C-alpha cells in the first residue's frame, strides 16, 4: 500500500518561490529556504510595529527641525504647549507632512499658534 | 436513499489522532509522552 507522493514539492515549491532575492544559498538551498521564510516573516512583524514607532520618531524630529528655524528659542515642547492650550484636537503629526509640502501653511499654523 | 447522499451523524465517528505529525496537530514531536522515562520508551513498560 505504497504511498510515494508529490505534496512536499508543492509545499516546498511555494516556500521556494517566496525566497527570491536572498543572495545565495538563502535563495536556492531548501534547508535554508525554510528558515529564511521563517526569519523573513518575523522580520516583517517587528519591522511593522517599529515602522509605526519609527515613523512616529521621524515626524517628531521633522516638525522639531521645522519649528526650530525661527531662531528665537521656541522648542518642539512649546509648540505643543500652545498647540493644546489653543484648542486644536489632535493634528496627528501630519503637520510634519504639510510642514514641508505647504511651508507657508505651517507658517500660518505657527503664526496662529502665537496669537 | 442513494449511494451518493449517505453520511454519518456528527459525533458518531471521530478521527483517530495521529501522533508525531506536527506540533500544530497537537501531539507532535514526542507524541504526548513528555521527555524521557519508561513512559516514553517503547516496549511493555511498567507492570500495572
Amino acid at each position: 500500500r505504497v504511498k510515494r507522493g508529490y505534496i512536499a514539492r508543492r509545499r516546498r515549491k511555494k516556500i521556494r518561490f517566496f525566497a527570491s532575492s536572498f543572495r545565495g544559498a538563502h535563495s536556492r538551498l531548501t534547508r535554508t529556504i525554510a528558515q529564511q521564510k521563517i526569519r523573513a516573516l518575523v522580520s516583517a512583524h517587528r519591522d511593522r510595529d517599529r515602522q509605526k514607532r519609527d515613523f512616529r520618531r521621524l515626524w517628531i524630529t521633522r516638525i522639531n527641525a521645522a519649528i526650530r528655524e525661527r531662531g528665537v528659542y521656541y522648542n518642539y515642547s512649546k509648540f505643543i504647549h500652545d498647540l493644546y492650550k489653543r484648542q486644536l484636537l489632535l493634528n496627528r503629526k501630519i503637520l510634519a507632512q504639510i510642514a514641508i509640502l505647504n511651508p507657508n501653511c505651517i507658517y500660518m499654523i505657527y503664526n496662529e499658534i502665537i496669537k | 436513499f442513494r449511494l451518493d447522499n449517505l453520511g454519518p451523524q456528527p459525533g458518531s465517528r471521530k478521527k483517530g489522532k495521529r501522533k508525531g505529525r506536527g506540533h500544530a496537530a497537537g501531539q507532535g514531536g514526542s507524541c504526548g509522552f513528555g521527555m524521557r522515562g519508561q513512559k516514553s520508551r517503547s516496549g511493555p513498560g511498567i507492570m500495572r
Binding site: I38, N104, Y107, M108, N111, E112 | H23, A24
Partner: peptide, 28 residues
Amino acid sequence: RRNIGHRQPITRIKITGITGYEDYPAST
C-alpha cells in the same frame, strides 16, 4: 509557530469637493 493572515476590511473613497468653510480666515 503560527501562520495566520489578515485581510483588513478597507474602503476606497473618491472625493467630490470641499465646501462650507468661509469663516475666520487666517492668511499671512
